[PDB]
């Protein structure tokens, strides 16, 4: 995702015998990243039946 | 509080501070008008625009 910095700097004298000068704008980056996970683990049938629960 | 005043520096690193205390309430200023405040300007045979403020 983008953005504009704000603007910077200085004014200048205002006069005759002389003109302005105009001025820019940049930009600038941005990141992320996207992750996953998971695991399992398992049981069995006969440790079941013979121990008293599941 | 402000992040904003004066600070110098002498050599081997030693910091001074300033912290004027006004606590007047005050001194004074006016702000007057010029003519113009606003324009808008734009160059046809090239191709840009521009503020100005004054």
Known sequence: MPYWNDLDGDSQVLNDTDDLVPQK???GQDKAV???RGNAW???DLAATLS??? | VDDSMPVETLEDG???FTSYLFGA???GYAEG???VPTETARNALGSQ???INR
């Open chain 1, 52 to 54: 008293g629960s599941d």
């Open chain 1, 42 to 44: 398992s049981s069995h």
């Open chain 2, 25 to 27: 309430g005050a001194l």
């Open chain 1, 34 to 36: 996207l992750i996953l």
């Open chain 1, 25 to 27: 704008i940049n930009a």
């Open chain 2, 49 to 51: 625009d521009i503020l």
């Open chain 2, 33 to 35: 008008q010029p003519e």
């Open chain 2, 14 to 16: 030693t910091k001074v």
